[PDB]
């Protein structure tokens, strides 16, 4: 049973998780990072060259794989990780709740361009709207990710 951060693009998982693992002396994993590196392509290049369904298969399979990990880990998650039925039972999951506009504001241009599902913003907005219920139903605890990192850190630690 790990500590799994979940949240739409730009909700600050990757760095939170890194802070969390330092404070708790646990190993940090990042699902995008793991797939990226096995396949030797960036997530964008994966979408572009191999198509989203394959990325989705990689994601879906890493879920199952990480369940066979022994040591509690901190695990940072890609936006879309909540679409997967099998996410249930991986770890106590912490949802980095923000609102579309705050979320978007803090991704510089280069940084948006790393995320294929931000190519069309109107579409990015409906995705947010749809994903909301999938975060909520996969969340052990909901965290107000609006303030700084510490403020999200504080809230997470409070839930042990
Ligand atoms: N408290 C915070 N709330 C939201 N975003 C933050 C916060 N603190 C830092 N960030 C920003 O989040 C940006 C992108 O999120 P990141 O850390 O990559 O996690 P994610 O995997 O959810 O995209 C970082 O480049 C950083 O500037
Ligand atoms: O929400 C999604 O479908 C995705 C979000 C991205 O993760 P980040 O939350 O690190 O930007 C990455 O997994 C990919 O572009 C798909």
Residue numbers in the entry: 2 to 161
Direct quotes from the study:
The shikimate pathway is comprised of seven enzymatic components that convert erythrose 4-phosphate and phosphoenolpyruvate into chorismate, for subsequent synthesis of aromatic compounds. SKs belong to a class of P-loop kinases that share a homologous α-β-α fold. Overall, these structures have a characteristic α-β-α fold that consists of the CORE domain (residues 1–31, 61–108, and 124–162), the SB domain (residues 32–60), and the LID region (residues 109–123) in the monomer.
The HpSK•S3P•ADP structure shows clear electron density for all residues. This would lead to a small movement in the peptide backbone, propagated through the α6 helix into the adjacent LID loop. A subsequent large conformational rearrangement of this loop would allow the side chain of R116 to bind to the phosphate group of S3P, as seen in HpSK•S3P•ADP, or possibly the γ-phosphate moiety of ATP. Superposition of HpSK• S3P•ADP and E114•162535 shows that only R57 and R132 stay at approximately the same position; M10 and R116 are situated at rather distinct positions to interact with S3P and NSC162535, respectively. Additionally, HpSK•S3P•ADP and E114•162535 have different contacting residues, (D33, V44, G79, P117, L118, and F9, R45, F48, V83, M84, L135, Y136, respectively). In the HpSK•S3P•ADP state, NSC162535 docked into a site where there were no direct contacts with the Nη1 and Nη2 atoms of R116.
